[PDB]
Each structure stands twice: as C-alpha cells, then as structure tokens.
Structure 1
Amino acid sequence: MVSVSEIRKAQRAEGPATILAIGTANPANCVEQSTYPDFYFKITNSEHKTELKEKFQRMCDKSMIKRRYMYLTEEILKENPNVCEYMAPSLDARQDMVVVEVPRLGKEAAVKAIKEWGQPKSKITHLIVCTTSGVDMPGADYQLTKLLGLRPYVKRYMMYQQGCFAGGTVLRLAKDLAENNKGARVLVVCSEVTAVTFRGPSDTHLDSLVGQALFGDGAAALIVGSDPVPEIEKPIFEMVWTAQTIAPDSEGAIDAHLREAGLTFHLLKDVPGIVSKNITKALVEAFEPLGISDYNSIFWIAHPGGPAILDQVEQKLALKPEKMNATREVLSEYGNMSSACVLFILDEMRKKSTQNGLKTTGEGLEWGVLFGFGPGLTIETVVLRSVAI
C-alpha cells in the first residue's frame, strides 16, 4: 500500500550542506605564553628540574602561540595537587570539572551561533556535540539540549574522545544529516577543555611536555543546513565533498589514553613529516575531480596541531606564506584547541574576508580545503565553496 520511494523523495533535502552561522567561546582566564614556563614549573613544583625547564622554555618560544584560554586557574590547581603531578590518580576530579565546563562553554558558543542564525531554536532538528575532554551518561549532548532549551526530540550525535581531527569529522557528519533530511538544521558544537590533560612535567616524557605548551580551551558552534531560505538565512560556506584516511607508516604517531590519572598524551613519530608527506595525496583526491591543481588558488584551513605541521606543509607544497594566515592567527591567539580549532579558523577567515571587503568569505577565492589531523594518524578533508560577499 505505502510507497517507500515517495517517502524517500519527500524526506530528503536538495542542495549542499551549508554553514549558516558560526559562534565561539573561551574560558575567561587568559594565560600568556611568554611567562608560561615560569608559571607552569612553579605550580607543578618542578623548579628544581632546570634542564627540563629550559627545554619547555624552548618549546613555548617555538610554539607560535601568544596566549591560550584555560578553565584551570592557579586556585583550582592549588586545590588539586594530584592534577599537578605527572602521574597521580585524578580522573574523578578532572571529570567533575569537564562534565560541567564542556557543556557550559559549548552553550556560550551555541547561543552566539543561534543569535547570528536568527531563526527559532525550535527549528534545530539535529545536534552534534564533540569533545575530547571527559565522558558521561547522559552525555554533553543531553546537557546542551537542556541548557539551551532545544526540543526534546532533537536528534543527537555525541562524539566523545575523538581527538584533534574531529573538527573535520563533525563537518563530515553534519553534511550527511543536513543533505539527507529536508528542513534539517544541525547545531554543531565542539567544546574542548584541557583540565583532563594538564599534568606536571617529567624528563623521560618530553612528548607529554609538548602538549603542555600547545593545548588550550575553547568551543565553537555552527548551524548547518541544506536549502537555505534566501535572504532570511545567510550562507557562509558550502560543503561539497569529504574524506577521512589513515596515513601509511604512522602507527602510534599520536596516542592518548583515558586513565585513572586523566588523559595522557604521547607522540611516537614525526607528525609534521607524516602530514607533509601525505597531504598531496589528500589534495589530489579532493581536487583532481574539480580540475584544480594549483593549491595557492584555493583557501586554506588546517588544524594547527603545532607550528611545524603548518611550516612543513607550506614548504612541501610551495604555498605562499599568506595561505596559512587565518590558521596561524587562531594558533597565536588561542593555541591548539583540538576539534574546535578549525571552526575558529573558518570564523576568522570569513570575518577577515568580510571586514576587508573581499569578494567571497574564502579570502576572495571560490574553492577551499579544511583539514583535521589527529590520532591514527588520521587526516580529515572537507572541500568547501565560499559564498559571495
């Protein structure tokens, strides 16, 4: 009696998934990088570890981060000595912090995106929440539904423990949700808080120490939908194609385990080298089909895992130095905010493009690429089209 083909035709959307709003938020505590080596070796009781401190100083000076925003303060750290050691039982304390902070910080970004979008929050049909900072049941998705007053029937996607490539993952996911469901409007929230990874220094664990120089806190929210209502909704970027891959010869490059002492961070391989050696393949797969081979002719968003990733990618491809401007500006002002980073970079790029009177939201160019890099070694690729004005 019932036609499933009719139902399917009527149920799906028509156009490309489009980013219609972007809002960001960060903890109020601003931590300068210039003075971080002294602060960090003092709050973790490691002033006697002189050679290690010099190594950290060099890491921080080479980081290309001016400041980061951190939920953790000196007062919180003084009440949690176990978080200040390299390896002490402290997950319960860290979970107590991030179970509340992740949704709190996410709500601030989401309210900003919803205001920019300008449409009723009751029209949000899908919610994607992503964090690498803590886990809980009901998750941060349920908390954000409650905090924001979304409809109880919002369709939720709780992305936990994903790592630094997940800014690309939430876009890859939102694309399918928006494009396959007529009228769908997806709220996407990436909210990352370093209270689960912060820990004291150890001279036999320099990889962990690198994480202490680079990771910072922040949340970014998007509204994504197909078939934007012309002159009511305002397209910013369109997604056209996505991919995810694991680079060869990268087993164990980046591992992070959630333990009784919190989330540990290890680096066993040359991440900048692996990314640089495999970025061309990723570009060819995405852009060969569009007939584009000049990678300076597209706009760039790259997860700034560290400055060396960016520097080696630029060197490998012969990118003009300006291609990574928006990426490096976010790195400089906020550090590596894991999954939220690339979403801050999209916001920086469309704001600077609009502010400076360029012709599109992608620096005056039509096509662009967004990359996420993280454990596996995983590379996420999102091909974007900019919007006029």
Structure 2
Amino acid sequence: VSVSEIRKAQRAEGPATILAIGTANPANCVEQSTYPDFYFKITNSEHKTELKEKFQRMCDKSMIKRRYMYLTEEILKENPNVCEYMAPSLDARQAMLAMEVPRLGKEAAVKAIKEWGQPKSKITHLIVCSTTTPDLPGADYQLTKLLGLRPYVKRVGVFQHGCFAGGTVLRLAKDLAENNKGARVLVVCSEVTAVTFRGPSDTHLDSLVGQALFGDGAAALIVGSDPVPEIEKPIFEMVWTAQTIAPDSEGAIDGHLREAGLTFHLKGAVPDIVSKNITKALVEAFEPLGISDYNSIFWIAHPGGPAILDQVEQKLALKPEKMNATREVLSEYGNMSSACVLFILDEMRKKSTQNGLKTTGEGLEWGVLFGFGPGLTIETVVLRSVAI
C-alpha cells in the first residue's frame, strides 16, 4: 500500500460535469417600473422628490423588469433601522439571514436533487456560497441540517467573496469532483438582499444603484465526474478555470461588513474595466483550443449591470443574440450576485431543449462563463455543451 496505488485508485477519471440545476426565489415579486414609489415610501424619503427622479432613471435603464425579495413591507415595517440610510442594524439583518439563506438554499437544492434522481445520501461534498454568513457554524452547516444530508458530507462555505463567486464555486466544485472517485458535489449559491438594503442618500448616488439592481435567489447544482449513464444526465462539462484581478481596479467594487450592515461601493468605471480586460481573459481561455471567433461559442456573463453586457458586446463585436440568455435572467430576476450565472446556465439549457436545438449550449460546442466582482476580480470557466 504505497501512496502511489492509493492516489491512483482515489481520483476520478473524467471532467467535472453539471448533472442538474434548480433555482428558487422568495415569493414576493417586486415590479421594477414602480419600485421607486415603493422604495422611497418605505425608506421615508418621499420628500427627497429630486433624488427619487434620479432613482427612477436608474431603474428605467437597469433592464430589469422584476426582482424577488424576502424583504416585504411588513418585515421592513418591523425593522425601521434597516429602512434608515445608515443606522445600527446588523443584528436585525443577521437574524433574517440566519433563516432565509439556508431556507431559499434548500429549496433550490431540493429541485436539483429531484432532477438528479439519485439518493441525497450519495452527495459527498457541499459548497454553500452567500455574500455573508451571520454565525459559526457557517450556512453550509445549516443547509446540511435542513437537507438531512449525511453528517460526513465534506463542506466548504464561500463567504464575503461577492458577485464573482458563481465562478468561484464552479472552480471549487471542478477540483473536488475531478480529484475524488465517486464524488458528487451539491453546490448552492443563496443571496438575499437583507444584507444590502438601506435608505437612499443624495450623496451616495453610487451606492443608490445597488438598490435598483440587487435581487434575491438561490441556485443549486450537482457536479460530478464519470457520469453514470442510464442514471445520470450530463448538462455541461467544465474544461478549464481561471481567476484574475484587473489592473488599476482597486476599490472599483468593495464592501464593508459593519454595525449598520453591509455597505457597498460601486464605481461607474466598472463596465470599462470589464470591457478593457475581457479580451485578455478570453485569449488565455480559448487560444489553447485554437478559438479566435467569440461568436462561435455560447455566452454566460455575470449581469452586474446592463452596461457591462453592452460594452463587452461592442468590444468583441458579438452578435446581439449572444447575450440573450444573460439578459433574460437580468430582466426577470435582477442581480442576484453569485446565483446569477447559475440561473443563466439553467435558462440556457432550458431554452435550448424547449426549442429542440443541437446542444444544451444554444447548439454551439464550446462556451464561456464569466463572474465579475470585488477586486475587480474576473472568474473564467470554459464549458462544453451536451448533445440534446
């Protein structure tokens, strides 16, 4: 019994494959068109008339038609400090996150496990990602409790990473499944805006844009290598992963977990940073495959905001339809941070099937998934579609 024999008989043989995808969102649906009226009223800023008009323009150009929020008029009426712009409110928000994050997360995981069709007891690893986690144990522990998974599921919680973490969990899931024979990784991203909601300030118009973009949602996947045919159904294959920090971007997107909750900073130069740095990311990802035409692959980009998508599109002269799946999710759910790119994969495989195309990847063969966040960090995931 050498380390050699053990090592060989311990790893998996094939690439990490996404075998199921399920999503969930709080029940409360908030229409974008009339959110301003609602927001300024609930945050007692109906006098800030001049600033409201500014928020209306932000929503009207957000390219989002609705979002789902755990925060309701009733809940907010119960927590006035969360409605103020900058008041001590962390403890209240932590109580909300302790319950909703795992609840919404479980709901998505249940749909995913049901599509997968195998015993939940076969889940060997669990990755749970959220913008923040309120306590110790982290939310990965609470989700395992709710799901009733085996006590020995290997857990990894991914917290305070941010909007690019959808790529992060996929990069993490790829290695856990590829290096371990028989491993089946349940991946869950669950983001709830109770962590970021706050009143408006006619001084932080930069932060005000987060309130017009951020929505709630949870997305779950089952990832594994060496799919069992007649028992499992591959959706996408992961090929290669990368993570990088854009130069001259320190402070473009950051946050501070404080007594008043999670404060956030957004810079208007974010879309430019992403656009200026996207070609580089692609070359590194696709040149090895000998791919130069970026319209010959399917696309999944974190919809941080509509400008990021527009400028990436122009930069690479992408056909207008490349970003359809990404804009569809932005339109129906808003920016759900880490969960976005997972909803997009689901929308894409679903639309591809619904409409009888060649592969789950809009008929195309190769594809890419991008996550953007604090750093500014860029996560890259090369994917391969599956024949329908």
Deviates more, 1:47-56 or 1:354-363: 47-56
Structure 2 Cα separation of the partners of residues 309 and 248 of structure 1:
17
Residues 180-225 of structure 1, C-alpha deviations (whole Å, 9 max, x = no match): 0000000000000000100000011011100000000000000000
Q: In structure 2, the residue corresponding to 1:257 is in which secondary structure?
A: strand
- Give the deviation of 1:162 after TM superposition: 1.3
Q: In structure 2, the residue corresponding to 1:305 is in which secondary structure?
A: coil
Residues 248-300 of structure 1, C-alpha deviations (whole Å, 9 max, x = no match): 11010001111100011112350000000000000000000000000000000
- Are the equivalent residues in 2 in contact too, given 1:215–1:338 (CA < 8 A)? yes
Structure 2 Cα separation of the partners of residues 67 and 133 of structure 1:
24
The answer as to 2:11 corresponding to 1:12 is yes
- Are the equivalent residues in 2 in contact too, given 1:133–1:193 (CA < 8 A)? no
Q: In structure 2, the residue corresponding to 1:383 is in which secondary structure?
A: strand
- Are the equivalent residues in 1 in contact too, given 2:237–2:384 (CA < 8 A)? yes
- Are the equivalent residues in 1 in contact too, given 2:236–2:383 (CA < 8 A)? yes
- Are the equivalent residues in 2 in contact too, given 1:135–1:160 (CA < 8 A)? no
Counterpart of 1:255? 254
- Are the equivalent residues in 2 in contact too, given 1:250–1:269 (CA < 8 A)? no
- Are the equivalent residues in 1 in contact too, given 2:206–2:268 (CA < 8 A)? no
Residues 42-99 of structure 1, C-alpha deviations (whole Å, 9 max, x = no match): 0001011122111100000000000000000001111111101110000000000011
Structure 2 Cα separation of the partners of residues 133 and 141 of structure 1:
12
Structure 1 Cα separation of the partners of residues 322 and 226 of structure 2:
30
- Give the deviation of 1:240 after TM superposition: 0.4
Structure 2 Cα separation of the partners of residues 268 and 28 of structure 1:
31
Q: In structure 2, the residue corresponding to 1:309 is in which secondary structure?
A: helix
Structure 1 unaligned runs (5+)?
Answer: none
Identity %: 95
RMSD, aligned α-carbons: 0.6
- Give the deviation of 1:161 after TM superposition: 1.1
Residues 305-353 of structure 1, C-alpha deviations (whole Å, 9 max, x = no match): 0000000100111001100000000000000000000000000000000
Q: In structure 1, the residue corresponding to 2:82 is in which secondary structure?
A: helix
Q: In structure 2, the residue corresponding to 1:323 is in which secondary structure?
A: coil
Structure 2 Cα separation of the partners of residues 297 and 185 of structure 1:
31
- Are the equivalent residues in 1 in contact too, given 2:349–2:362 (CA < 8 A)? yes
Query: Number of paired residues?
Result: 388
Counterpart of 2:144? 145
TM-score of the two chains, using structure 2 as the length reference:
0.99
- Are the equivalent residues in 1 in contact too, given 2:133–2:139 (CA < 8 A)? no
Counterpart of 1:111? 110
Structure 1 Cα separation of the partners of residues 88 and 181 of structure 2:
48
Q: In structure 1, the residue corresponding to 2:223 is in which secondary structure?
A: strand
- Are the equivalent residues in 2 in contact too, given 1:254–1:269 (CA < 8 A)? no
- Are the equivalent residues in 2 in contact too, given 1:300–1:370 (CA < 8 A)? yes
- Are the equivalent residues in 2 in contact too, given 1:128–1:157 (CA < 8 A)? yes
Structure 2 Cα separation of the partners of residues 256 and 352 of structure 1:
35
- Are the equivalent residues in 1 in contact too, given 2:200–2:208 (CA < 8 A)? yes
Deviates more, 1:20-29 or 1:131-140: 131-140
Structure 1 Cα separation of the partners of residues 254 and 219 of structure 2:
24
- Give the deviation of 1:231 after TM superposition: 2.2
- Give the deviation of 1:135 after TM superposition: 2.7
Structure 2 Cα separation of the partners of residues 355 and 269 of structure 1:
38
Structure 2 unaligned runs (5+)?
Answer: none
- Give the deviation of 1:133 after TM superposition: 3.7
Structure 2 Cα separation of the partners of residues 203 and 181 of structure 1:
53
- Are the equivalent residues in 2 in contact too, given 1:164–1:375 (CA < 8 A)? yes
Which 4+ residue blocks in structure 1 deviate beyond 4 angstroms? none
- Give the deviation of 1:134 after TM superposition: 3.3
- Are the equivalent residues in 2 in contact too, given 1:131–1:339 (CA < 8 A)? yes
Structure 1 Cα separation of the partners of residues 220 and 132 of structure 2:
16
Residues 217-238 of structure 1, C-alpha deviations (whole Å, 9 max, x = no match): 0000000000000121000000
- Give the deviation of 1:136 after TM superposition: 1.3
Structure 2 Cα separation of the partners of residues 133 and 78 of structure 1:
23
- Are the equivalent residues in 1 in contact too, given 2:164–2:379 (CA < 8 A)? yes
Structure 1 Cα separation of the partners of residues 177 and 301 of structure 2:
24
TM-score of the two chains, using structure 1 as the length reference:
0.99
